[PDB]
PDB file of N, CA and C in Angstrom:
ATOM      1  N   UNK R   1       0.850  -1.225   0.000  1.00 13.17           N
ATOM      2  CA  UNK R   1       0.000   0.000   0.000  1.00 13.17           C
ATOM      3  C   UNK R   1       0.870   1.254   0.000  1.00 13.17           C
ATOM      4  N   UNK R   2       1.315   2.045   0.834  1.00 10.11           N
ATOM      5  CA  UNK R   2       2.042   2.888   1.278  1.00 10.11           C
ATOM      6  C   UNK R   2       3.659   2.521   1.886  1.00 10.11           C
ATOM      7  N   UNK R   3       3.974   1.719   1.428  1.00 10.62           N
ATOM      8  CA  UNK R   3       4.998   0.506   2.363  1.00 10.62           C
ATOM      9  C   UNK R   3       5.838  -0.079   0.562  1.00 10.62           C
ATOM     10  N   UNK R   4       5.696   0.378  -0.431  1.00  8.62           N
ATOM     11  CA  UNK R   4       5.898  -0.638  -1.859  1.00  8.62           C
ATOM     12  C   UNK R   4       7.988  -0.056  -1.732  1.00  8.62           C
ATOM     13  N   UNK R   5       8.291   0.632  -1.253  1.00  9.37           N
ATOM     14  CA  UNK R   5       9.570   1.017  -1.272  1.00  9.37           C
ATOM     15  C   UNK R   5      10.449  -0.623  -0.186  1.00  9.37           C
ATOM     16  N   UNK R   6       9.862  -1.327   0.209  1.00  9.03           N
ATOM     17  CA  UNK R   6      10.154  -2.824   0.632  1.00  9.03           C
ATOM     18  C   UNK R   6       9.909  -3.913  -0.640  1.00  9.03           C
ATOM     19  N   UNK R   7       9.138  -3.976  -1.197  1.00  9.60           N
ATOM     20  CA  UNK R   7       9.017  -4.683  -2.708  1.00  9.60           C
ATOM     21  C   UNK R   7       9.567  -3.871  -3.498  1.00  9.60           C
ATOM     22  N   UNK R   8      10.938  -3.449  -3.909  1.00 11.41           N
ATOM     23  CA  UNK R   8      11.641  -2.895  -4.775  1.00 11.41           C
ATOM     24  C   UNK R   8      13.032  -2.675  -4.280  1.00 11.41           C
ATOM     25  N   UNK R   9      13.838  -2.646  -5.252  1.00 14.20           N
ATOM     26  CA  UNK R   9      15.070  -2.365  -5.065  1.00 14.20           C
ATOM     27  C   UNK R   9      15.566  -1.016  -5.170  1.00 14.20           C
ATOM     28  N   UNK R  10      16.529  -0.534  -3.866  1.00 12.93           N
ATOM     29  CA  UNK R  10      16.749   0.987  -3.871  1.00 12.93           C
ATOM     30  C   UNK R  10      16.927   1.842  -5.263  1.00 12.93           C
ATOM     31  N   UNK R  11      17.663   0.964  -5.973  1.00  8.84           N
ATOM     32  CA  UNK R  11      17.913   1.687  -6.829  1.00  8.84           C
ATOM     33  C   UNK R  11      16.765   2.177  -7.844  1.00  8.84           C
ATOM     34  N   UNK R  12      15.511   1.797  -7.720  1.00 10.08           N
ATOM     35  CA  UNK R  12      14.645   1.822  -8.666  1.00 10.08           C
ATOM     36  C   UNK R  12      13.538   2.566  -7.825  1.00 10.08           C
ATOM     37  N   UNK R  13      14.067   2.748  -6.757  1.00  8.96           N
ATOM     38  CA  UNK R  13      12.869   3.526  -5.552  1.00  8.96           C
ATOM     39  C   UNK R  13      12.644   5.175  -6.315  1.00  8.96           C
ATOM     40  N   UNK R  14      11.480   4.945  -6.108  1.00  9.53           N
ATOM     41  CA  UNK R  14      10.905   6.680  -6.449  1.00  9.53           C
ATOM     42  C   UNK R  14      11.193   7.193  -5.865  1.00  9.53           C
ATOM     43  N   UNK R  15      10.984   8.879  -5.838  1.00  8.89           N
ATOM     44  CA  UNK R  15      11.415   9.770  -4.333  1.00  8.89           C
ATOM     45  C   UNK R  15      10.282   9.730  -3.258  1.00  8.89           C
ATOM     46  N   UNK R  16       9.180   9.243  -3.557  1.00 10.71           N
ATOM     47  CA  UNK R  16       8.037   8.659  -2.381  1.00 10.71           C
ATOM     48  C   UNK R  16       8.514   7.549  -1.784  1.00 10.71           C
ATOM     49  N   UNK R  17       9.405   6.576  -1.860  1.00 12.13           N
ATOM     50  CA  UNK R  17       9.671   5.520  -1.359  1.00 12.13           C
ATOM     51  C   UNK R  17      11.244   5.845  -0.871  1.00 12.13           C
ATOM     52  N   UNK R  18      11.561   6.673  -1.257  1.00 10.86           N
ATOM     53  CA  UNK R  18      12.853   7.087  -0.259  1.00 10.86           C
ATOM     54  C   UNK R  18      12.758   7.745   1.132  1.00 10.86           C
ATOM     55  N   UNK R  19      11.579   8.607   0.530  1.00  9.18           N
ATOM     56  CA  UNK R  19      11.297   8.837   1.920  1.00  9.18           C
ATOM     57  C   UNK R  19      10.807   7.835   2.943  1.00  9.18           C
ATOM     58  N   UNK R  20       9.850   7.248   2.248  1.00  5.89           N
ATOM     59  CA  UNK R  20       9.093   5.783   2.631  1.00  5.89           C
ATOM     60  C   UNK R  20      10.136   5.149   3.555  1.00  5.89           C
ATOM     61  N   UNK R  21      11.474   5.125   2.811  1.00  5.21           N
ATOM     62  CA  UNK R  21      12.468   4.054   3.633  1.00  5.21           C
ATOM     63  C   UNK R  21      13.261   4.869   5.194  1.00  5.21           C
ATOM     64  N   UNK R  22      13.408   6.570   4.695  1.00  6.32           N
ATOM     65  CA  UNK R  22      14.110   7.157   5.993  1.00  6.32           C
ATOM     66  C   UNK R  22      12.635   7.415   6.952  1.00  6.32           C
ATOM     67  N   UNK R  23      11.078   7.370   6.694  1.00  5.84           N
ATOM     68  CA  UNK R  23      10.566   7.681   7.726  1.00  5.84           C
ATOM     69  C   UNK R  23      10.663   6.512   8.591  1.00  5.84           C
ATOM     70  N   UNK R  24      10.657   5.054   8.222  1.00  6.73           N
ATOM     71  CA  UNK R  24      10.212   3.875   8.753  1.00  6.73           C
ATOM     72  C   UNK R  24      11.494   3.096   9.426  1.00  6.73           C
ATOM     73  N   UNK R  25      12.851   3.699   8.768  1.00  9.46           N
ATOM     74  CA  UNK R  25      13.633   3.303   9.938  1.00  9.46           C
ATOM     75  C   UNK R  25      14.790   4.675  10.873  1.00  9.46           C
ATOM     76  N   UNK R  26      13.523   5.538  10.630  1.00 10.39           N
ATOM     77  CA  UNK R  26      14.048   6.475  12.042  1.00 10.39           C
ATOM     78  C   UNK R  26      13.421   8.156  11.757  1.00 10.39           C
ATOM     79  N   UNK R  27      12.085   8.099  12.842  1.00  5.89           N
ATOM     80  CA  UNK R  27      11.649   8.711  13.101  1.00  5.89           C
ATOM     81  C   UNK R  27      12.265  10.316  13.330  1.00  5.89           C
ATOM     82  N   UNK R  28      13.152  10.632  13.540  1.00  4.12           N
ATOM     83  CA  UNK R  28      13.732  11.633  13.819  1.00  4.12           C
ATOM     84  C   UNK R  28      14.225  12.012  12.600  1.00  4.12           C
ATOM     85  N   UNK R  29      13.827  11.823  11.189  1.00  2.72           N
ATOM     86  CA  UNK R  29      14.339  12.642  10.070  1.00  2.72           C
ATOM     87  C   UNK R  29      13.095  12.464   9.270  1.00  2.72           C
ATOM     88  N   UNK R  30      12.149  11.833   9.765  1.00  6.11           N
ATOM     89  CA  UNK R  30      10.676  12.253   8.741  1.00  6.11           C
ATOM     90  C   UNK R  30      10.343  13.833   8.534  1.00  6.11           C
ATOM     91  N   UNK R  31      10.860  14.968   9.320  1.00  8.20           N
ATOM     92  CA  UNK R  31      10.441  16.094   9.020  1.00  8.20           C
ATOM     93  C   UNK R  31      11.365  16.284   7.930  1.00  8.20           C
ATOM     94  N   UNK R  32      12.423  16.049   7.223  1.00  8.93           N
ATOM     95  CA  UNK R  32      13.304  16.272   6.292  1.00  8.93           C
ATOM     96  C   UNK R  32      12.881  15.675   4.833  1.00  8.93           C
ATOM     97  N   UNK R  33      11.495  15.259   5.026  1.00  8.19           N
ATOM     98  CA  UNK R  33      10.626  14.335   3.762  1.00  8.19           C
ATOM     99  C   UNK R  33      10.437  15.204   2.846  1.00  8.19           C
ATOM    100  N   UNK R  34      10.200  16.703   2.588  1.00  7.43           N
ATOM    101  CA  UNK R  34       9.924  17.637   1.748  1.00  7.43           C
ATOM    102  C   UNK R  34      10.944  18.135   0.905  1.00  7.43           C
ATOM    103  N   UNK R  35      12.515  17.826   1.946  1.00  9.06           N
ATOM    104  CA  UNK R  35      13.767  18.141   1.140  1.00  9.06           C
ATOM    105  C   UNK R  35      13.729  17.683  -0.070  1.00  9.06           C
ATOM    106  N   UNK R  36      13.891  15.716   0.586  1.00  8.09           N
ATOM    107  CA  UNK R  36      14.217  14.843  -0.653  1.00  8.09           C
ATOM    108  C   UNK R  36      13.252  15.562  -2.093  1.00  8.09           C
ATOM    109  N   UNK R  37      11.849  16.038  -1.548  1.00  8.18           N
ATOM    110  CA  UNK R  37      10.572  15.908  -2.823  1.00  8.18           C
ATOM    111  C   UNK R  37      11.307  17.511  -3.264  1.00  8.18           C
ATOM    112  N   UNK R  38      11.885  18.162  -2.729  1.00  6.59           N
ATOM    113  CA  UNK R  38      12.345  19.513  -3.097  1.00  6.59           C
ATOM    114  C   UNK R  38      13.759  19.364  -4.335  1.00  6.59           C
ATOM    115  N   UNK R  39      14.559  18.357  -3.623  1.00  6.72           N
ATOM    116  CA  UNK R  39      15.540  18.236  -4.235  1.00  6.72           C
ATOM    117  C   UNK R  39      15.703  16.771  -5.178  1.00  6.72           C
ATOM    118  N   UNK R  40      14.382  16.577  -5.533  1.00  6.07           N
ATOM    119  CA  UNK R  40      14.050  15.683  -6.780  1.00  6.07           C
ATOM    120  C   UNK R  40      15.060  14.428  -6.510  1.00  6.07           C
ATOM    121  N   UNK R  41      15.132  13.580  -5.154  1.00  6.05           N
ATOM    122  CA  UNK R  41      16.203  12.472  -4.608  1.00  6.05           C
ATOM    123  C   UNK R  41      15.325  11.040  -4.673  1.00  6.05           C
ATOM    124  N   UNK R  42      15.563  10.428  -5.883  1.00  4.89           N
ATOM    125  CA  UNK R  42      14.610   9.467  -5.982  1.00  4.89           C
ATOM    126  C   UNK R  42      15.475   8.673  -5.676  1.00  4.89           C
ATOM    127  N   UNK R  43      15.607   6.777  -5.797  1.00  4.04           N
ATOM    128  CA  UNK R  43      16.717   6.236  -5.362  1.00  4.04           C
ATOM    129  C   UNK R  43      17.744   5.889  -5.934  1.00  4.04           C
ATOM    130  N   UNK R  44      18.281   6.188  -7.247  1.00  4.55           N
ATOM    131  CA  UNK R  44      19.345   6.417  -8.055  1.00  4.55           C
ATOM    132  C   UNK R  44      20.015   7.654  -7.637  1.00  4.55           C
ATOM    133  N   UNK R  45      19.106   9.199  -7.240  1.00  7.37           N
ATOM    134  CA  UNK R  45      20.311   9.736  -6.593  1.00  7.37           C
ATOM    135  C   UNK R  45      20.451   9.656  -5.486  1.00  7.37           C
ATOM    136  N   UNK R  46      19.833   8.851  -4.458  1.00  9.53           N
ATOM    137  CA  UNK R  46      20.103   8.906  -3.139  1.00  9.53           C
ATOM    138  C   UNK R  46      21.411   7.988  -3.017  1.00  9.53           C
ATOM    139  N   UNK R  47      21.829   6.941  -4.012  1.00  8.51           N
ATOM    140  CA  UNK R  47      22.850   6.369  -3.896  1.00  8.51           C
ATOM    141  C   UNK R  47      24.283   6.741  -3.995  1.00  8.51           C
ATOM    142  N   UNK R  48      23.663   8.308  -5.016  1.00  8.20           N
ATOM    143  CA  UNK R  48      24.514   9.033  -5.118  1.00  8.20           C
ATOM    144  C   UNK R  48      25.137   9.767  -4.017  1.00  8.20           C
ATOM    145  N   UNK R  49      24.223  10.363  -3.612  1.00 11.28           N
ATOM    146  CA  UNK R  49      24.139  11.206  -2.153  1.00 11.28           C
ATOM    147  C   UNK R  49      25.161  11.032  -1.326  1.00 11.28           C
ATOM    148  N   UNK R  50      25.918  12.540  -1.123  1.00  6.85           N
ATOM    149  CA  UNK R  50      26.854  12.079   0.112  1.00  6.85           C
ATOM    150  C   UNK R  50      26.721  13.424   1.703  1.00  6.85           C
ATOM    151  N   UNK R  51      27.337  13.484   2.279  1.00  3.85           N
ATOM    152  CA  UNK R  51      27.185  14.269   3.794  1.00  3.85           C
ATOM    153  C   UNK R  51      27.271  15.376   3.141  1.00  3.85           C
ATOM    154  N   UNK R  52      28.059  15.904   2.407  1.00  4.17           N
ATOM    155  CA  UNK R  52      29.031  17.005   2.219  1.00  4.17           C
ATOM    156  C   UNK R  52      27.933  18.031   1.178  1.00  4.17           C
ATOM    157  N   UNK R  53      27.124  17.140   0.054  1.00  2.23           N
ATOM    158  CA  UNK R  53      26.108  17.658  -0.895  1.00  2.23           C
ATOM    159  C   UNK R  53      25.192  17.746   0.195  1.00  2.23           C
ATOM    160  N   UNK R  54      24.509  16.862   1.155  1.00  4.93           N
ATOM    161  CA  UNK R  54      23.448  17.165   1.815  1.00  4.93           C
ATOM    162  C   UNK R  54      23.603  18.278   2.177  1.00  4.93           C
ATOM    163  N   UNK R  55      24.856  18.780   3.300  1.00  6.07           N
ATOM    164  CA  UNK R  55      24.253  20.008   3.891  1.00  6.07           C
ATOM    165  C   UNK R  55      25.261  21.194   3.063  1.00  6.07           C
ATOM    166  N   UNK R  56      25.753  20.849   2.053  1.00  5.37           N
ATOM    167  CA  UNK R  56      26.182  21.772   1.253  1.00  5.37           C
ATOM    168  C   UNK R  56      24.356  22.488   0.221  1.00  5.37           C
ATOM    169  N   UNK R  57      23.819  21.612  -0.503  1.00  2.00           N
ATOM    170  CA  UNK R  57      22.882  21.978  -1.575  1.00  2.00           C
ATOM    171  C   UNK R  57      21.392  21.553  -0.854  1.00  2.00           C
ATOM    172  N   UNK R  58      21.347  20.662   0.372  1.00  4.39           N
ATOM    173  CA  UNK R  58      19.849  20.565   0.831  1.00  4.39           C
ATOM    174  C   UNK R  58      19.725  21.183   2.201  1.00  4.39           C
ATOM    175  N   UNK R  59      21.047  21.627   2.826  1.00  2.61           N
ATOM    176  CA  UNK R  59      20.595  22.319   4.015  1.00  2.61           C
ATOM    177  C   UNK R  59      20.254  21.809   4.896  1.00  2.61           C
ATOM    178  N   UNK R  60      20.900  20.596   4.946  1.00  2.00           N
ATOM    179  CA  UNK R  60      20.783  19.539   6.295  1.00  2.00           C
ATOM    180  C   UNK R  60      21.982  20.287   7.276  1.00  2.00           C
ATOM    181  N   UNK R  61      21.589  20.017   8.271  1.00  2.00           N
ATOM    182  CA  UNK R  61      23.116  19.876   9.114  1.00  2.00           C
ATOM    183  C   UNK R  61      23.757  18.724   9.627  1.00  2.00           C
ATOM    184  N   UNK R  62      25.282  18.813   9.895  1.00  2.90           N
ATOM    185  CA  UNK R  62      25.943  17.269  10.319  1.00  2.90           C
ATOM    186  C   UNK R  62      25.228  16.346  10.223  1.00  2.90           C
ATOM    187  N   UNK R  63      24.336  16.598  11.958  1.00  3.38           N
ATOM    188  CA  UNK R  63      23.717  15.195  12.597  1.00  3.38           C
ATOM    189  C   UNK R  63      22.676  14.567  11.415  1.00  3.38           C
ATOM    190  N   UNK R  64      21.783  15.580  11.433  1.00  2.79           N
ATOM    191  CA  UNK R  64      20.864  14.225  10.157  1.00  2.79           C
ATOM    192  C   UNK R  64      21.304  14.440   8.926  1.00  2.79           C
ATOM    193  N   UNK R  65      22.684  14.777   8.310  1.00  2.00           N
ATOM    194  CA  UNK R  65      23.201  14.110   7.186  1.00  2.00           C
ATOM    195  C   UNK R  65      24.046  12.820   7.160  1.00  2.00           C
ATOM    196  N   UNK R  66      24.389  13.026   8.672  1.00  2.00           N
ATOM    197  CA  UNK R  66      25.075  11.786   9.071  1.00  2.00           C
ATOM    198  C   UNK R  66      24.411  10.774   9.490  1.00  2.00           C
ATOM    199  N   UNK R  67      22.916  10.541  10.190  1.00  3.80           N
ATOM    200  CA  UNK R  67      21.779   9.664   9.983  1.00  3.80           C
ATOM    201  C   UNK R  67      21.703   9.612   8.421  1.00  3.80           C
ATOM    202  N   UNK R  68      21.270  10.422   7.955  1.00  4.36           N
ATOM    203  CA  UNK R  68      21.181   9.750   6.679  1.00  4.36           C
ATOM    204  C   UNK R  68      21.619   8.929   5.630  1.00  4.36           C
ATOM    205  N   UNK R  69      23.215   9.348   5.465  1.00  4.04           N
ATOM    206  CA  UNK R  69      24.237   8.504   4.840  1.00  4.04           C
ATOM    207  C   UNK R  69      24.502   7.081   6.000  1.00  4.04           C
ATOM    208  N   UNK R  70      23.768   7.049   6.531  1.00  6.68           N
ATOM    209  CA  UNK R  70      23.833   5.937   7.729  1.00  6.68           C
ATOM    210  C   UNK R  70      22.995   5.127   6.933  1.00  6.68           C
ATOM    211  N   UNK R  71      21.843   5.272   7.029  1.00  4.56           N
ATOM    212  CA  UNK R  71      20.636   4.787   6.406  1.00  4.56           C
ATOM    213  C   UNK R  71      20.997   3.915   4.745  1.00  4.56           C
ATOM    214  N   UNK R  72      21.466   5.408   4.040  1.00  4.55           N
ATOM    215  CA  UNK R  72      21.491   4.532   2.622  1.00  4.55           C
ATOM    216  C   UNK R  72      23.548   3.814   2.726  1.00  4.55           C
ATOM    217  N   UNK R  73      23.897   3.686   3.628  1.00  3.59           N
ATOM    218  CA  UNK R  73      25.048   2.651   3.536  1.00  3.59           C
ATOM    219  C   UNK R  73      24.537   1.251   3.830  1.00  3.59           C
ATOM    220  N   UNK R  74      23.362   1.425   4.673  1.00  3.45           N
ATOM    221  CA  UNK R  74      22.360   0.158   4.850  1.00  3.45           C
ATOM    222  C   UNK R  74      22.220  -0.544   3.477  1.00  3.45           C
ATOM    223  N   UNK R  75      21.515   0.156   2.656  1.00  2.00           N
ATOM    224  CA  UNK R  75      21.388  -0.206   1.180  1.00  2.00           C
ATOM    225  C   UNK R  75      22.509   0.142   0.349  1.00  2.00           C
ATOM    226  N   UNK R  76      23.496   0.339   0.763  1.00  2.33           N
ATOM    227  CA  UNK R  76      24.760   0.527  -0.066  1.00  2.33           C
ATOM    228  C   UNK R  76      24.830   1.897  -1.052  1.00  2.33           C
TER     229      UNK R  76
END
C-alpha cells in the first residue's frame, strides 16, 4: 500500500519511497521528507548522495546528514 519502497530495489525507488524508507527506519528525520521531494532524490540519486552535498545543496546539518548517509550505507 504505502509501504511498496520494501518490494523494490533501492535503486529503482521513487522519491516517495525514499522517503518511505528514511521515515520507517528512524523517526527523527521524517520532518526532512519535503527536502528529498524539493531536491528531486529518488533512489538512483540517493545512492549518489553524500554528507558534504546534503548540507552543502539541501541544508541539512551534520547530525541528520550523518543519519542519513547511515541509512542509505544500509542499502549501499
Amino acid at each position: 500500500r504505502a509501504n511498496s519502497h520494501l518490494r523494490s530495489q533501492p535503486i529503482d525507488w521513487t522519491i516517495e519511497e525514499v522517503i518511505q524508507y528514511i521515515e520507517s527506519n528512524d523517526n527523527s528525520l521524517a520532518v526532512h521528507g519535503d527536502l528529498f521531494r524539493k531536491h528531486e532524490i529518488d533512489g538512483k540519486a540517493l545512492l549518489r548522495l553524500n554528507s558534504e552535498m546534503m548540507m552543502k545543496y539541501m541544508g541539512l546539518k551534520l547530525g541528520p546528514a550523518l543519519k542519513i548517509c547511515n541509512l542509505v550505507n544500509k542499502v549501499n
